[model samples]
Target: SNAMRPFQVQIPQADIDDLKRRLSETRWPELVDVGWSRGAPLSYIKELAEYWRDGFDWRAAERRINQYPQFTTEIDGATIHFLHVRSPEPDATPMVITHGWPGTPVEFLDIIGPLTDPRAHGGDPADAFHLVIPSLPGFGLSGPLKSAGWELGRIAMAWSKLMASLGYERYIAQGGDIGAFTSLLLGAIDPSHLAGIHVNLLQTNLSGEPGELETLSDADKARLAVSERFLDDLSGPMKMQSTRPHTIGYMLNDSPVAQLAYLLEMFKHWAQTENVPEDAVDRDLMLTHISLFWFTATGGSAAQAHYELKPFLPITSLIGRSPTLDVPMGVAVYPGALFQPVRSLAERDFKQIVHWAELDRGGHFSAMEEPDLFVDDLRTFNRTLKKL
Candidate 1:
């Protein structure tokens, strides 16, 4: 299990086979004239389904993913797969970047080079990062979580061990979606070694014990508005799996188009700012992400991640420092990226935020869609870390 799960070329065969079989045996569900009221549109889903049957290329992308260092190891009986890319600088700080649900290590595909060797990406080598991108257990090659309790907090502990195993004494953390929670826990559970964090998303949300919005200067009110707008447009398949995954699993497991449409709709509405499909991301690249899940038979497992995670939320944010991260922090908000709380809220939860920036471009999948922007912003923020 220590070997990077081979990016076996077999996924194409399975994906293509599922596509043809589904197209052959499709049982069209009665259409309701919902008209963009919710979820993916039927017409669009159908076209993606058709593409799954005829146009998508799994092997092409698989070969691409295989080009990097990928290996898998079982931790606590759950196999974990990750890409460990060394920095060009021996003294480079290690950074563990985790991907969210429905996103693979592929999310960081573009930013790896820039981050690990900033000099290569038009920045200083002093900013180089030894990157560890893990496919969280129960997602991708870390498939079928062995049991419950595999949520963010637990995942963070595992990541902590992973870093120590690799001999990193001080490192940085960052992620989007589910990765956001994991990165947060990393800072909370291991702040001594966790130098800082940069998150594209944060859940400043509470279903219960909602605190009065923290005291803030007028400047912070504006940032909090950004947070509200993000929650207003909130909501997805990965979630469905976490809550009632089986409802869609059969269709996705059996049909390539079903899987493609399921994954794409999120990218369309949720991936970027403004909720406009194709505005925050390249539609083709987003499609490629969907294709990866469909081909790997990972759609359901990836969504199941939410199921394992939702119950693990700490009931109170007022917990002691042990579970709260006080590390230097930076946030890069793109239109459509989830939560972008004002400085007041951030100051309450994160004790040492040194940098914050909100930009016009980017969304949930920042590294994938706006890698250059993400790199630039992260580099600028990392520049502020106590000049160690």
Candidate 2:
């Protein structure tokens, strides 16, 4: 059998030199009001900029990332990269978690230990999961998507194939951001095998509400307004990145700083903050993602994923082959995340919304900012799931 594409990235000397040069050449933008009337609070941006240059350690993060058991297989003629960490718990239930755009497999690291080894992480054996966190087919290590139609349907097949390859007859899915769609696709296409799917909200582009905004209640409407304001204020990159990705790709490919800025702006706006202090997200973690794109020279390839995937999607009805999805579903709500789904609207999708935790804790990057909450909630959710 063919070995999956190389588990690690090999960066060229010229690219490394270029990243160093561009980082050095960064012209400090003028400081706006610290409270952030403009983009990426200048105070916070400057601090992150300095840490990226001074304190961030890429090798350490890379080494840890590489520590996972990585394998790739030809799915849809494209190489898919995944972290297949088998739980020490011999009977761990297989679990697959997919990440959304602007995020990578690292997003779920905090949950790995607790998920795979619940007893060690202070939970019962029934909650244990043999985790599988796959890099989206084209993003990060799985670079250069091969064709169009790399949307959720295709991605779901690839993952199910990957799961089947790993011998997982039954598995559960957890996702946020783009991964949520992958999970839903898993449900639609993998009805017999997929145990259940959990997610933040089924979204295409966080493009405010698709239509008839008035249909939502006042609280839901307010979040939609916040999401609209967010789109108006920060959709510049998303617009081009998703629509005219090739143009932006050139910049990210040519300059690591350009890649950094492109990804960081989303972090600035999306990560539950108008303030991006050094501690807001692991400074190195931010760079690791950009470094992966730069090292792979696949910035454009990553964006091409959207060319095939839709920007605005709606799940207007509840329908699936699985039974009430008693398969077990969990929901974690983040008020500040680009858009908060109306529970009523969301309920239409999740037939067995087993666990619901409303938290003032975190936003889009919940795993990093509020790992404890995420870990605790997920464990609690899985526990309830087993009992049912």
Candidate 3:
């Protein structure tokens, strides 16, 4: 059935209590005083685990999420969860924003107001958007995927159907990380209905034959160097999830402490912060994301999507040889992002680059860290497209 059933976040009291119990009963591990060099340090993990047990308020977070209209529906044999916030403006554009791995729909909460109600946020009413933020299949509220082969292309098709079901005959798409890939795929698979696509990250394989790289600008070469460093140092989790997702999923599903440590490491490394993740993102919001994963027990299932994508690691091979995006495309480059994208390299795949911005701050999770910048860039890109 394609019914969009109304949904509210209502975790049982017993489940909440059990999480606290597990956090309290967690067995501690010993580590050398090497700090974050090895991984999330023992001291940091312990402190966070203690706080997760006593300080964090799951109910408060749940209430905030429930403040918006949420719904679930069956799309291609799997349940899809999403937040659909309609703008009061009659001229609002329909847009579907997506979230990536280690992230939930909560990533876009801060920007929903500005995007959906630009007037209320002190912006021109003409910039309003009707927002559809979805959790990818096998992730967040769309957890424990019932079937296999839920990769980027498959999820993109599901998104197209989701938009149609909501009576959105034409819409634009935007995303970062895995979401970016999905939005790009959406542009390819459903060009008839898509207005345009905007993305914050581009995973292009910049490696070229001998002397092929010499043609690139020095800035592009420097960006390539930074991307290589990220792959060398911070890609351990990607490799693990790609190869043995279920194994790590089992560990994360069993231990709250393990889940916190695993996710906290990504936040610490990916956000625009020098030291702790809290330096850039709010602490409670981070905890809320961690809690969403823990309570839903989707940790293991979320890894399944990665396993399906192992064949398309760089994601460029799929994009480069595929059809050129028929619609206008926009790119937003964050200086602190993990995989720095080269505009020249991206041009090989996306020819219709209508708008591109090099943002001053933010990282992989730009929507969460800098909502103002994220919203402004999205609006700026939208203005480049003609109204459908």
Candidate 4:
């Protein structure tokens, strides 16, 4: 019981003051002509940094964050902070949702209400979920990791244990990005207890040109071309973060601007929006994400997750090569996400995809970008399990 205690978000006023001071003291950079081709544009980040300093209220953010009951539990010598909200429905299914990199539990705040209390959000009472959202190790309050080797499999194992610890004999898993890999690993490694899993991102390569590959339609090929473009351009962060996190982590930790630019660069490109404009995903919500990085100082530790997964970048190296997954899986394709999976190639890895939906919008951060669609997709997948 001692290891599992209630947690609250309470940053000291002095720390808040220091953040403002740092924001005020920021050294401005000159704008480049190439726009986002260079990176997070100077003017974009400057305005965001300014809003973070003056307009954003950490107290309000903290209050909103603390609205959900939180607890910290030690697993594999690592502290995992999570929100555990039970649905009002007595028969609500337990669902463990994990977040991807440059993302925290904050990413799911929008959908938490819809998920845990769907009836209140104008959904069937039977669709409710007893939600468990974990702050991945070396991320947000769960970080900065004291050791290395917290790979996807390790995190998945911890999640199974977390579910069991809470007396959840049967449950489902859902995630996107890194979290997707984590949940998939969970289903592979611990399939018996899991009812199913739903993921927005499915990492796999088109291995050999099987007959199925030849049957691919023009749309699939176009999407595959886009996926190729994605891998070609945005691998620098993966190269450094996966190979030498600590080297760059010092820069990330010591400087707020470096941290903001590092994360904002991803948001600018990853999101469906053309420009950050005034708000990325609501200025306040977006700042909370940046604030989490600044306040927790886990930029280095989080990057090390990339370092830990160096062998598994691009998902190309292990598509047909991976062992066939036996668990029931659902793949939801959000158009603007990093990887555009060909259903045939995905079927090569995940044999039992129970649900698949291709959305016209939303990006890497689907839960934040389109909470209604995201929540509905999750409910639809889980409903299949409910029938069984």
Candidate 5:
């Protein structure tokens, strides 16, 4: 099963039909005092559920996705699915981009053309990238992981092999959220092969305690307050899923409404906006990501990724220190991110940081919310590697 095989998404008609049937029979819940205060508003769920059942076209979404070349291969006893798009320019540099939980390869679909064919997108061809985007183990088309222990370290190891399989001797790594962890880990795991890394959402234990907020800037302080708000109110899902994924897996896998509600709340809360999540990103694009989770039954396995990472989290700060990583690094700070770390705090860890950008807008989902900013920042950072 180690064979690399070309892949196309072809969910059976039966599965599609079954999803519609279940959506029709969904049991209604009680009316809340205030919508979205308790969780994702019931009204929002109803609207999304109805669209998901009747109006949404999975085939159209699937067709849009299939426009890119995709493949799957077994790595470390788990099947991994990935999209490898080469730039038109022969001198294009290779880069592996990773997606975090609740996010899939669909997250990068919008930026692929700009990255791989910048010349066509009215950008410098020298900024072109040969991108490799993978579905994390047990997420989306990668399929459910068969057993435990699919942590960041293990996944990064698989990425090392995956890149070698594609004939890349040197490449840059990039990610956000869980993808951020992989991006940092890749540099640590294979600094010889991995040229450098750039991350939009840099995750670390800098904010482990609330008192660490004292030295932050006014904006960063505001972001810390936002994070505190999320932790106090909206972080239940993270705590629950990270500890007991299987217990809730049954509900999320069986009930499309539950899956939609669970994921939609995060999109709404975490996105940088004053109104609904759709205000920050396209509603249909967000639904496309949730649909992939629903179709693949990965609602729980994806959350379990946090549990897999828990044990080794303390050791993760090695990204900016010795004994692990010694590669060039760059970080793009999104003001509205769940955790907006200041550059001074980052320097305490990432010693060789070469590029640092703080954007005017965007949040947890950087590429989706602000693709132009994300694409430009990535290009700017990678350009630093060329000089060295």
Candidate 6:
């Protein structure tokens, strides 16, 4: 039976104390000063860890997140957690937004108000949407791997069931990173109920034929270069997680600093920032995300996503095996994003791209980094869907 029960962010006081103890007792590691080129710098991580132990407030984060309504339900044996914020507008569209690895539903906190209450946020009420933001399986509150085989397709099916259970017959899906793949899969698996799908990150094959490389603009070339660099240098975590999630889980699950450094490194490189992740995203908010993972001890469990997705390597291959997605698709390409999707390459797989926008700023975490732009683009896409 599917039962939707109300949930809240309620970390026990002992757990919070345990986190502080772990952060304080973290064993210091000595390293030569080669800066972030090697990864998260030792000094910077030390500073961040100190702040996390002394300055960061978990209760405040809980209160901020608790302000919105959240709930949990059993989906295929795994407990799924999500935030369901309904719009005041009677004709609001239902939309399910997903978060990726190292990210929790907390990532979308800033955009929730503007999206659900567009009129109040200086937008037309007609563009409003009732948002459903869910944490991926084995991540944050939906964690510790209730069962194996929680791959992308399985997660997408769970989302389909989740939305239907919530009484939304029609809805749109949006995501970035892993969420982007999940959104695309949702469209493929449940086209009848999914009105449209939007994604910020376009993870497609970068290997193009002879003329394909020459036709791209300088910016696209640069984006491709970044993608290449990511695969070449920055994909260590992906490789490790994909192969040995549980092995690495032992370390991440035990040490708060290890978990913090692991996530902070990704946030530093992925977010639009000069040197630190704090430049693009709020410090406390970032810590709130890290805190969620730490308190839930889901750092290793979250890595299971990569393991499950290993067989699918370049996930784009699944597009061929899955059903054709007839629903309209919209894309918001952030200039600073980790991977940029070429319209031509994407068109090879996705046929119904109704809207595409190259935003001026922001990176992987578009909603968190630039909520106004993210909100505007989403509303624009929603408007396009209404016209059809």
Leading candidate by TM-score: 3
Residue runs of model 5 more than 4 Å from their true location after superposition: 207-226, 312-324
- Local accuracy by lDDT, each model: 0.69, 0.69, 0.85, 0.82, 0.82, 0.85
Considering lDDT, which of the candidate structures 3 and 4 is the better prediction for this target? Answer: 3
TM-score each candidate.
Answer: 0.85, 0.85, 0.96, 0.95, 0.92, 0.94
lDDT of 2 by residue, 1-388 (tens): 2355546645565766666677788776655475654555556556666676677766677777877788877777777788888887787777788887777877776677877777886678776788888888778887776675677677888888888878899887887867877787677777778766777644322224445445667887665456665566866666565677778678778765567767777676677654463345666776776678777777887776555564432222122222133446778887557766666555654577777778885778777667777777766776676676
In TM-score terms, candidate 3 sits at 0.96
Give one digit per residue, the lDDT tens place, for model 1 in 106-217.
Answer: 7777888888877776778888878888888767666665465676777888888777877889888888777877888787788898789888876553212335444456
RMSD of each: 3.7, 4.3, 1.9, 1.8, 3.0, 2.3
lDDT of 4 by residue, 6-63 (tens): 9998888898888888888977776765777877766667877888887889999999
Question: How well does candidate 1 score on lDDT at residue 87?
Answer: 82
Error of 3 at 173 (Å): 1.0
lDDT of 3 by residue, 1-388 (tens): 4899999999899999999999889988877878788788887788888888888888999999999999999988999999999999978999999988888988888999999999998889999999999988888888687778887788888998999999998798889877887898888888888889999977656444564477888887677677665676777777788888889888899999889888877788888888888987898899998899999999988887668877666522423344566677999999888778777777766878888999999988999999999999999988888642
TM-score ranking, best first: 3, 4, 6, 5, 2, 1
Higher-scoring candidate on TM-score, 3 or 4: 3
Per-residue alpha-carbon lDDT of candidate 5 for residues 1-388, written as tens digits (9 for 90 to 100): 3767999988899999999999999997887658678777777788878988888888998998889889999988889999989899978989999988778988888889999999999889998999999999989888887887988888989999999989899999899877888888888788899789888986444534555556667875555445566567766776676778887688698888888888877788777867688887787788888889988998877778877876543223312332344689988989778876667566666778899898999888889888889999888987998898
Error of 1 at 330 (Å): 2.0
Model 5: how far residue 174 lies from native, Å: 0.4
- Better model by lDDT, 5 or 6? 6
- Per-residue C-alpha lDDT of model 6 across residues 1-388, encoded as one tens digit per residue: 3798999999999999998999889898888889888878889899889998899888999999999999998988888899999999978999999988778988899999999998997778999999999999889987678578888899888999999999999899999878888899888788889889999987656444565667778876666566766677767888888889998799798998888888877788888889789899999999998889988989788989888887655422322333456689999999778787778767766779999999999988889999999999999999999888
